[PDB]
Amino acid sequence: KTDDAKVAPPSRSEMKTSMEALIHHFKLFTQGYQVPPGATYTAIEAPKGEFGVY
Amino acid sequence: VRIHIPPKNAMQSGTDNVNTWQIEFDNRERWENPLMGWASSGDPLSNMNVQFGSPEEAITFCERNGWRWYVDGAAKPKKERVKNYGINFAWNKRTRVSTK
Amino acid sequence: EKGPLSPRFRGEHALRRYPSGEERCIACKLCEAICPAQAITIEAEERADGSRRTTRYDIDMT
Amino acid sequence: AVQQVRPILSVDREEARKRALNLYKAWYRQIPYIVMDYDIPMTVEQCRDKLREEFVKHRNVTDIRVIDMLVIKGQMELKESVEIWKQKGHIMRYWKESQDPKPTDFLSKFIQGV
Amino acid sequence: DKPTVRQPDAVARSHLSDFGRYVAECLPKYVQKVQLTAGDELEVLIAPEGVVPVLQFLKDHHQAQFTNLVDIAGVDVPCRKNRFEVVYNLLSLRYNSRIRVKTYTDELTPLDSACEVHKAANWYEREIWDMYGVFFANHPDLRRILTDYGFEGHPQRRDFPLSGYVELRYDDEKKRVVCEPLELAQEFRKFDLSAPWEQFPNFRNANPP
Amino acid sequence: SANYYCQRDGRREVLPPIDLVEQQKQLKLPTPGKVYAWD
Amino acid sequence: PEKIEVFVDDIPVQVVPGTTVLQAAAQIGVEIPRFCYHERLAVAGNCRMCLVEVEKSPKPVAACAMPVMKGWRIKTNSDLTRKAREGVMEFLLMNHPLDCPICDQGGECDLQDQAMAFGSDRSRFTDINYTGKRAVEDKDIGPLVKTIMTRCIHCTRCVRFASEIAGVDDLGTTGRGNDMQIGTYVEKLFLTELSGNVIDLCPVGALTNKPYSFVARPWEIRKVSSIDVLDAVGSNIVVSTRTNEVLRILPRENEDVNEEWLADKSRFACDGLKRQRLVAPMVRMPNGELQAVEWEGALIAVAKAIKAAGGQIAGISGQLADLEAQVALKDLLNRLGSEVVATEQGFIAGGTDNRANYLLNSTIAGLEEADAVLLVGTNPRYEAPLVNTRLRKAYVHNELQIASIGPKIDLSYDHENLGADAALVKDVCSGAHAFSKVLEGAKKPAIIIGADLLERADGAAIHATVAEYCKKLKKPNWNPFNVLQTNAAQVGALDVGYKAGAQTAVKAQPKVLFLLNADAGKVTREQLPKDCFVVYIGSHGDNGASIADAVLPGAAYTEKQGIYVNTEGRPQQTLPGVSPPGMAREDWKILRALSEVVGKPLPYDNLDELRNRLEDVAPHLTRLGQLEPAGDAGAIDIKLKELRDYFMTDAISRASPTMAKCISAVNKQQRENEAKQ
Amino acid sequence: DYDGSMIPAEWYGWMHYKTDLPPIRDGCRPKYKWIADHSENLSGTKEAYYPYSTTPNKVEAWEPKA
Amino acid sequence: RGDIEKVTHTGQVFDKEDYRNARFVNAKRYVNENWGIKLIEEVPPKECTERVVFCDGGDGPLGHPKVYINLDKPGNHICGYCGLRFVKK
Ligand code: SF4
Ligand code: SF4
Ligand code: SF4
Ligand code: FES
Ligand code: NA
Ligand SMILES: [Zn+2]
């Protein structure tokens, strides 16, 4: 995973030990993470064709 | 339909979650579910919530859809508060704090 | 004959408990809040001995 | 309190009135076909009343653009009913047969509960 | 130096910036504003009438050659007066680039169909009419494409309840499925996922009046 | 050490959309990108 | 004075000199993080979370306490400011006990939310594996507030509040260094009507609601803004609801009335709504017992009494009654021709003529500016705590001078006791008394008289003198005279046209009597004529129901949208957060329905139709959340002087299991205290 | 009447290749006193399951008799 | 049968007159017999010497979060998560 524990949940072993990991685990699962305002269109070469999500 | 500002959470000091006007419908009936005891309701609009920038827009939106509305009084802007620190240690005034 | 599977396989649910026998769940309700399907319902109450615990824990497997 | 806008289909209430009547024509012509081609209890006279009953719903409408939209949607159903894309269930959906009457008098509602 | 932060593609950013201005001069009548999104993606905000002109210009001009129309997304925003926005995602194979054209419309005002320029928008426009209720003038045959036959309302407007108003069931009296007012065994449990502390200060003062 | 989140973080670095026309005023023909031979 | 110029993040601002940096940035819309600063408590600089950079300064300056100086360039979102906040979070979160799954504050915790927004993501506290964190013993503060002191962050909000707002000075700080702890040195009970508010100030889960423990989580809750009715102040409320049940009650901010505080009786009445509740209509059988019966049967059974009564009908509004239900009760009795429509509380005869004769003409907010206050037969610390909170605010800040006439009491602040003699009030009015000079000199004098005294027989003369005296003290835009009410029903009833006093109904000797939420013991089955039919319309089966011949269940204030008029005259609207239980229905629905079975249908069949009937009786009653000034107004002994008497005053409160614990707890300490001595 | 559900949890992992170690050959298996013997899936039977709310009712109704 | 009248550990049971027992005439009502309130009560407390100790559920990463307890008071102290009791003597 990316290091940022504010976007990605932290390791379970670290959750049981460090205070910050437990807070972030608590918030990332109840409230989730905040995405900055904006819009985007990404697409990939899905096997059927171009699959995009605006 | 009740135009209102969502109420600030008394158990917190943050405020950026009350920077909108909202609409919430009447609180129609709910009842215990006979089988498992969940909460049940036949009230589709009771689930509803929309955000606005000002009551004028909120009224404008409500009129354009035929809803009956009534606006809660907008909270008046809080009066200025002095909040000086030195007065906590005052010579003859009662504001002197006995704690620290 | 059947399988093969892997230890990560996701199947039917189950509430574990400590080796003492006490239930592990403390009615934190993280599971309820994250459940994408809202399939979990929990009601918690201060137990007689004073431990945070559930008086209700329902999963709607459908 | 007036504003400039882009018309939908018509420019005048009279043209809007003209379009709405045509929609009544086409429906009124079509009822005999719908009865034959749908296995539904209703007869032509009953249906021809339902057409009258509902065109009356929008009795107080005034804005031409709103009248245009009602005629756009009103026409769309007719094509979906001139065709049999709408199934037997959908046609009878115009009657709300399953829903039984809910009394309106205060005393009955109170006794029945909210 | 910092791996977690995504690296901006400056070369792609540079081309889109200049070509973004280029469109602004060629179409003064319609292009209200041009802005380069934080994702290094270009957005062209046009007036409602400039849909067919602008789309034609991007597809046919030598420099644009945005031959491929990918999407037409509709966005509902009850706050704004023209609550419905329509977004076109175009792709230019020859130049290997994407551009976005946005426009705004009201509940009633029609929006000029672009089947002509790109007739890939035959169904996309049909979807937009069905989901949001935006009418498209001059369309070949506008008609609901997704919702049920005789479904009343437009589900994807933000002013529409999530579960809808009516369910379906089978009634053995009538020997057919019948629609009844909605009745859920368990309500949709809201969660108030609102943070009391602002996190993105860069957008606090953004968009001055 | 030397791991302050204020540098590593990416969320707080995104800025609003930039207005191309104005940011000149305050400050071969152009093309959307680089030509490709789709033929 | 002249606005000073200061730039926060390079945006110019105008601020009066003396403004703090935190306040100055508020005007822009910037919210600096904070833990120890609270807007209604004395400034302290413990937490150091509010630290902020200032251009050309040696070090960060605490925003909460720094008074702005001209020309500064504050830098909230700079690298130096960000590092400062990260440091403190990394510091605050060392010894926090890792309890979020079992901590009530979870999902509502400032330490959580500010950790995400500003603090770092990692933890450098390697020493978990060698010496461990800190752990602090727990404290037994009482039956209302659970205490887990290991989560305390030593913000001292609790200490400052209890010393400044409640004025108890029983909580404090002991020790130093890491071994510092907040709490009583010797185990005691933190006994105060305002004790609950501590639970909201503590930004972490150290102090928390004990009755509400573990019941639910914040994200689950659906918030329903309402008002309180257990007290006359009409404090705004947010009733937390989840799946058709009231979990807790929280204070909604309202500067003019509530002030974000909330008295305990309002805060812990949510248990009373789940006990001794009336579920089905009940009727007296010929043997003498009550049996539950269907609605159609009950309304017809009551209808027989009404026809056989033949006009000798009377009604008695109660304590929790509703304005809309009260109006229906009035109309229904007028359709029958009867006019004996009274309330439970007595009052000066002829007092309903002028709307100023029964209100706090000096608004609740207006009292905090007061300069000389005279309390006649009123213990506002218990009768209406939220008003007392304003008096103490004036006493601390505005240098208030106070006096009393009645039994000796403690108000949480120094005040003179002129004596309990009746003749004192005429002495103060006559000017001969020493304190009379104080009131005639102050720039904002006020006279507060308890509504209980007015009900007393002497009340009419007492009401005349002070109402006569106020006109001398009356100053431009200030109305000294003030009557303090204790029931949310009373003001509305008098405002609609009710008579006052339950003896206005007994004196008619009616053959049929309606007790609308009238659960006081004022009426008794002996005082009724032996041929009578008592019909009780209420929520909680109590002594009021114990006499009734036909009990019709009503809905409590959490399940009925109703207008209430608080003491100062504000009309406010409750909202239904919870469906009424069993076969309960709204109070006015019954009366509206009861007219059908009697034959005289009321003019209205919906609430909006009912509200317009109020709009015709009293136009101001429609303008919710507003006040209309009423201009001129034309041995003392008190109930409710002990804390023990504060909890059990209403049917809802009297049925509360929690309030039973509080009564036992207060009694428990007193028993032990004398035992040791 | 053999069912796929008659396999006790002891051997269940070994049978689905989750492990290569049979229960006899591993000592990491626990032997707690609250473990229960296996059972079939009992459906269409008098021994089947049937859900019920696990919470006693919250609101108490006033008793007139006392 | 027996199971109908059995009262669960959460303290709920259908009254003998309540119709909702109808659902159990053709099925069973499993009431768990291993009541957690009694099994944890059975385990004796742990005597310690240090002033503060930690419980992690007993198995580190497979247990619950590490919490520290202060043993200054006389009464034996319960762990929030696992329910185990500690005491200093
Ligand atoms: S409520 Fe859910 S997430 Fe929380 S301890 Fe219980 S099972 Fe685990
Ligand atoms: S106060 Fe409670 S919720 Fe907040 S960080 Fe501490 S343990 Fe977690
Ligand atoms: S107990 Fe709560 S309010 Fe008091 S100092 Fe500690 S954290 Fe602050
Ligand atoms: S808010 Fe300023 S130091 Fe606490
Ligand atoms: Na708290
Ligand atoms: Zn433990």
3+ Cβ–Cβ pairs closer than 8 Å linking H and I: yes
Sign of CA dihedral E140, E144, E146, E149: negative
Assess A30–C contact: CB distance below 8 Å, yes or no.
yes
3-state secondary structure of G505: helix
DSSP code of residue F23: H
Cβ proximity of G182 and G155 under 8 Å: no
Rounded alpha-carbon distances, angstroms, from residue E190 to E193, G108, G221, G616, G639: 9, 16, 8, 40, 46
**D and F touch per CB criterion (3+ pairs under 8 A):** no
G38 interfaces chain B, CB cutoff of 8 Å: yes
Euclidean distance between CA atoms B36 and B43, whole angstroms: 20
Burial zone of D45 (CB within 10 Å; 0-12 exposed, 13-18 middle, 19+ buried): exposed
Q: Are G154 and G171 in contact (CB under 8 A)?
A: no
Cα angle G149-G150-G151, degrees, rounded to a multiple of 5: 90
φ, ψ dihedrals at F37, nearest 5°: -100, 65
Is residue E125 within 8 A of residue E72, CB to CB? The reply is yes
3-class DSSP assignment, residue C3: coil
Chain D from 85 to 114: CB within 8 A of any G CB: 106-107, 110-111, 113
CB atoms C60 and E189 under 8 Å: no
Both tokens of residue G278?
């009336």
Centroid of ligand 4 to alpha carbon of B99 (angstroms) = 17
Amino acid, single-letter form, for residue G448: I
- Nearest-Cα residue of chain D relative to residue E134: D69
The preferred substitution site among G153, G174, G190, G200 for testing ligand 3, maximizing ligand atoms within 8 Å of CB, is: G153
Pocket test for ligand 2, best of G99, G147, G153, G214 (most atoms within 8 A of CB): G99
Residue G419's alpha-carbon distances to G432, G637, G638, in angstroms, are 15, 11, 13
Tokens matching residue G338: 């009867």
Which residues of chain A have a Cβ shorter than 8 Å from any chain F Cβ?
3-4, 6-7, 34-36, 38
Tell the burial category of C15 from Cβ atoms under 10 Å away from its Cβ (0-12, 13-18, 19+). Answer: exposed
User: In sequence order, which residues have a C-beta less than 8 Å from that of residue E121 and are 6 or more positions away?
Assistant: E69, E72, E113, E114, E115
Sign of CA dihedral G462, G465, G470, G473: negative
Q: Is G579 on the interface with B (CB under 8 A)?
A: yes
Yes or no, beta carbons of G20 and B83 under 8 Å apart:
yes
Cβ–Cβ < 8 Å for G542, G527: no
Instruction: Say how far apart CA G99 and CA C9 lie, in whole Å.
Output: 30
d(CA G220, CA C29): 9
| CA of residue G109 to ligand 2 center, whole Å | 6
Q: Which long-range contacts (CB under 8 A, 24 or more apart) does E142-146 make?
A: E142/D72, E142/D76, E143/D76, E143/D79, E143/D80, E144/D76
Chain E nearest CA to G113, separation (Å): 7
CA angle G621, G255, G632 (to 5 degrees): 50
Closest CA to E66 of E84, E40, E93, E41: E93
Query: What DSSP line would sit under I12-52, residue for residue?
Result: ----TT-GGGGGGTTS-----S--HHHHHHHSPPEEE-SSE
Q: Is E164 left (phi over 0), alpha (psi -120 to 50) or beta?
A: left
Contacts of A29 in chain C (CB under 8 A): 30, 33-34
Are the CB atoms for G224 and G241 separated by under 8 Å?
Answer: yes
Closest CA to G244 of A37, B30, E39: B30
C19 and chain H: CB distance < 8 Å anywhere?
Answer: yes
Radius of gyration of the CA atoms of chain B, in A: 22
Q: Report the candidate in D64, D74, D60 with the shortest Cα–Cα distance to residue D26.
A: D74
Cβ neighbours of H22 (radius 10 Å): 12
How far apart, in whole angstroms, are the C-alpha atoms of residue G391 and residue G398?
10
Q: Which atom of ligand 1 is closest in space to residue C29's alpha carbon?
A: 1
Angle of CA points E109, E112, E118, to nearest 5°: 150
* Chains D and A, touching by 3 or more CB pairs within 8 angstroms: no
Among G90, G95, G100, residue to substitute to test ligand 2 (most atoms within 8 Å of Cβ)? G100
Of H34, H52, H56, the CB nearest to I29: H52
- The ligand 4 atom at the shortest distance from the C-alpha of residue G32 is 1
Give the residue carrying structure tokens 């005289």: G600
CA distance B59 to chain G (A): 18
Q: Which of C22, C24, C47 sits opposite I39 (nearest CB)?
A: C22
Q: Is the CB of G37 under 6 A from ligand 4?
A: yes
Closest CA to E7 of E33, E37, E40, E29: E40
By CB atoms closer than 10 A (0-12, 13-18, 19+), residue I43 is middle
The residue length of chain I stands at: 89
Ligand having the closest approach to the CA of G47: 4
Is I77 annotated to bind ligand?
no
- With 0-12 / 13-18 / 19 or more C-beta atoms within 10 angstroms meaning exposed / middle / buried, residue G185 is exposed
Q: Report the SS3 class of residue E207.
A: coil
What whole-number distance in Å separates Cα of residue E132 and Cα of residue E150? 15
In the block, tokens 């709300």 appear at: D96
Residue G17: CB atoms within 10 Å = 12
How far is Cα F8 from Cα E152, in angstroms, rounded to an integer?
50
Beta bridge partners of G74: G8, G54
What residue has token string 């592990």? C24
F11–A36: do the CB atoms touch at under 8 Å? yes
G64 annotated as belonging to a binding site for a ligand: yes
- Give CA torsion, residues I56, I60, I61, I66, to 10 deg: 30
User: Which neighbouring-strand residues pair with E86?
Assistant: E74, E103
Cβ within 8 Å, pair C4-H4: no
Contact H62 G245 (CB under 8 A): no
Alpha-carbon distance G571 to G621, whole Å? 6
Give the DSSP per-residue string, G202-224: -SSTTEEESTTTTS--TTT-EEE
Ligand 6 centre to CA of I79 (Å) is 5
Determine whether the interchain pair E63/F17 forms a contact, defined as Cβ–Cβ distance below 8 Å.
no
Q: What resolution does the deposited structure have, in angstroms? A: 3.3
When scoring C15, C16, C17, C20 by the number of chain I Cβ atoms within 10 A, the one with the most, hence best to mutate, is C20
Judge whether G19 and G2 are in contact, CB under 8 Å: no
- Collapse the DSSP code of C45 into the 3-class scheme (helix H, G, I; strand E, B; otherwise coil) and give the result: strand
Q: Which of B90, B81, B93, B85 is nearest to G396 (CA)?
A: B93
Whether residue F11 contacts residue E200, with contact meaning beta carbons closer than 8 Å, is answered with yes
Q: Within 10 Å of residue A44's Cβ, how many Cβ atoms? A: 10
Residue of G214, G219, G220 lying closest to C52 (CB–CB): G214
Instruction: Name which of A4, A39, A41 is nearest E4 (Cβ-Cβ).
Output: A4
For residue G643, give every residue at least 6 positions away whose Cβ sits within 8 Å of its Cβ, in sequence order, or none.
Answer: G191, G192, G193, G382, G666
| Token representation of residue G285 | 């059988």
Interchain CB contact of H18 with C (< 8 Å): yes
Residues with CB under 5 A from ligand 5 (ion): G 202
CA distance G162 to E157: 50
Locate all alpha helices (DSSP H) within E61-171, ordered by sequence.
121-132
Query: What per-residue string of b and e applies to B40-56 under the rule 16 or more CB within 10 Å gives b?
Result: bbbbbebbbebebeebe
**Do residues B59 and B32 touch, judged by C-beta distance below 8 A?**
no
Contacting residues for G195 by C-beta, under 8 A, at least 6 apart: G142, G144, G145, G166, G264
Q: How far apart are CA B95 and CA B91, in angstroms?
A: 9
